[PDB]
Symmetry: D2
Amino acid sequence: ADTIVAVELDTYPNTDIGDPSYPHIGIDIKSVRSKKTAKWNMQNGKVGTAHIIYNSVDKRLSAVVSYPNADSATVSYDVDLDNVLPEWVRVGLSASTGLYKETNTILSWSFTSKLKSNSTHETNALHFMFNQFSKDQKDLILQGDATTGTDGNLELTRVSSNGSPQGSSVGRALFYAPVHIWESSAVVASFEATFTFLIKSPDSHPADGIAFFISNIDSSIPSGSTGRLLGLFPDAN
Amino acid sequence: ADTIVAVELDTYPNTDIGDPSYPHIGIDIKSVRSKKTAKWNMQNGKVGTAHIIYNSVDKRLSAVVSYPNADSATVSYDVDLDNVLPEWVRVGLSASTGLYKETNTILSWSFTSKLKSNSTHETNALHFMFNQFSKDQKDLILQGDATTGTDGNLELTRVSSNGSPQGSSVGRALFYAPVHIWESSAVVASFEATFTFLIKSPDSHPADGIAFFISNIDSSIPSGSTGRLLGLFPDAN
Amino acid sequence: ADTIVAVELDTYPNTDIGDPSYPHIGIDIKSVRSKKTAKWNMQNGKVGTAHIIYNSVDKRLSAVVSYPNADSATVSYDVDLDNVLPEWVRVGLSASTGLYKETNTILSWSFTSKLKSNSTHETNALHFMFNQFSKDQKDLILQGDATTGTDGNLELTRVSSNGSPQGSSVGRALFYAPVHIWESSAVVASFEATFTFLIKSPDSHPADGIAFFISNIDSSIPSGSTGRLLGLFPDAN
Amino acid sequence: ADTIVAVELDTYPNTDIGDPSYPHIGIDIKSVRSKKTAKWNMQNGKVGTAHIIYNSVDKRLSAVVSYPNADSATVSYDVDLDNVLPEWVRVGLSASTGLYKETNTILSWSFTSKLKSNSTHETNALHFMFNQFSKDQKDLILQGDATTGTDGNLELTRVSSNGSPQGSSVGRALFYAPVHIWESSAVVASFEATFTFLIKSPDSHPADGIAFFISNIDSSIPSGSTGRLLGLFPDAN
Ligand SMILES: [Ca+2]
Ligand SMILES: [Ca+2]
Ligand SMILES: [Ca+2]
Ligand SMILES: [Ca+2]
Ligand SMILES: [Mn+2]
Ligand SMILES: [Mn+2]
Ligand SMILES: [Mn+2]
Ligand SMILES: [Mn+2]
């Protein structure tokens, strides 16, 4: 039902469904089986940063993930989003845990989209930036186990009182306002997203990951999408 | 019921309710009877621009209106918005006509709000800019007679096929996402709004005006607020 | 001597040096003989807009040129600017006329460059926007025949009192501050430039064109670069 | 000679020249004897943040300084900068030490100035943001003992190898490009500056302070302005 385009930070290798045998970043177009992936040297307990960029002229979705003092990981995929997504969409973050677990903490999130028309100086834009989340964040649609306010952070999946991450959890956060990514008179459409995250697990095998995604405006968590499905897909096809 | 703070571009002098005897700009705090006004040399048929600014440190709401090749008009009022408005609000534009009429056309509208916390680099922001409006503008809540899409503009009040403005009309447009204007750990909160408009009337006496406003998130057009009430207030108290 | 990367809006076809037989937009890497070009339906006397974009992840320089009510023209070229340009550069606009002529008027110009480091939230940026130019624009380095202030515009090449464009003219405008386009710890570097222009000629054959360019910081107009050389190259190799 | 407007973070009370008897923030208009001050609970060794704002409509220069987990300090002063400063100016940071000392480390610095003209959509802007400084920062004019690059920070005054601050030191950093703060057709001019700093001293009595300042473009450090004069004034009048 839902149309999903996402950049996944996959912490657990499910080789039975196409994941490489190591943590990786990937670009998912309507399927959890990434169209392209790159090895990611994930660091348990460290704050990392992900940057996602795209523009309608080049038609290439690219993402870069890094941690301080370390080399980055990058992945790119040629795709025309006009042919995949509706004209109006919502953007958000999703995460899940299953048998294995980890905290999926978001410390900041910014997004900027621009539509440049052929009229002189005619440019439409939307920009939001969160460097702190409140208990009652009215401009976010929280789904599943996601909550905001703990230490000013956004916890996508369940975490107990003692800070311990729970398994079989799924949660998403979408920006309240729909986003216009295509318009008939637009000559250039582009967006850039950045978010900082903290994945921590008491185990040697963290799971399952975090994903930045773009979807139809009325998207909701598919049934049974905990674990390897990242709260984004109904199955592994 | 609704809590309204607005900057009015009042084209018709209703001296019976406190308006000066000439077109004017004014700052309205919960009442159509402006707390402060300034003479405005309105130009029928010309595109004008309004700028509104405010910050929590100075606690002064100021507005400047101008037309190309002409001197500007300015008005300021000392007011602490924390004591007037809720923590979360919606921002929008409103306009009305009555016995007398005019077109209340909006050609562009931008808004920027920032909340700077005491945490290092911790800053929250929201920014939107419309330089063109679509027939189906999903990020705007249109109320009353307001419509978008005609020539890429936002028509706040009714206009016939031949471009002729109708009387007894009222319409408003609010940005879809709620806006956070106060937070317990914020050291500075501020906003700036800019919109360009085209007020045109076939008559020597245009009415009633356009207003930029901030209100509780669930605000709706009060009954009988056409004409002198600008689609904002239930009465003239 | 100078290292030049430029996007040319070439109005005169010099087929003897590789130009296609029609006005065109092209990407020039250290040579006036464009690495790639696209047909451009230039409109004499109309205000057009050019958008240039690039990022270090995709390594693709793309440009889009358009006029109101018309289809756009686009050109892209895969090039790693790190391998062509110095770490610090200046950005500017250049134009020329020769035997044939045209006005090379710039009405607005904006530029944004960003360097995102691997440190958390660590981002460096520079942004400038001119929608009007003054007689004494201290933040611009004017070279050759370029002047600012006439009607608030930037005239890159000589125009007489009666508004008539002169031949054999060359002029450039560079932003005063050097721009940092590469840094050892940067994970993503990108820039976007936009400018609106008005090319008008009394003749059926306008020449020679306008170019947005990036160069070493101490770049100056090469001798004899009027005409087909666009004020950028010392010869046609 | 120089014309200086500055916001001082004064760490040492020189009661003989008008300082209150405690660390304080103040607004200086052409004199080290602040026109207005506010008590500042300075924290040795902690990273603080200063925000400075001003606009031509309200004509009020305000500043807010804070540290994480602490209440802020604010100071405001009504002043028309058009009557004090030239049309073109440079903005920068200055610091000094004398008999007493401290490190005057700047970790980030951002600035935004805007000039809104009465022409439709006509807006000029300049924005820069440094979250990291390089050894060779070509867009900064360093004066005196100021250096960049150590740990990616800007050290305004001398610090030895072991990280120990030196006395009798003075240094300033100015952004390379001049800034336009007034224009004949501007209806609103405004600026906002933010910088984060780390003042650390091995002594119970740190000195002398850091100041954000605006000056004539060719400003240089006055002779003998170490110590209480903050590298800004030639004497204490
Ligand atoms: Ca997986
Ligand atoms: Ca009235
Ligand atoms: Ca040519
Ligand atoms: Ca002192
Ligand atoms: Mn995967
Ligand atoms: Mn009124
Ligand atoms: Mn060519
Ligand atoms: Mn003092």
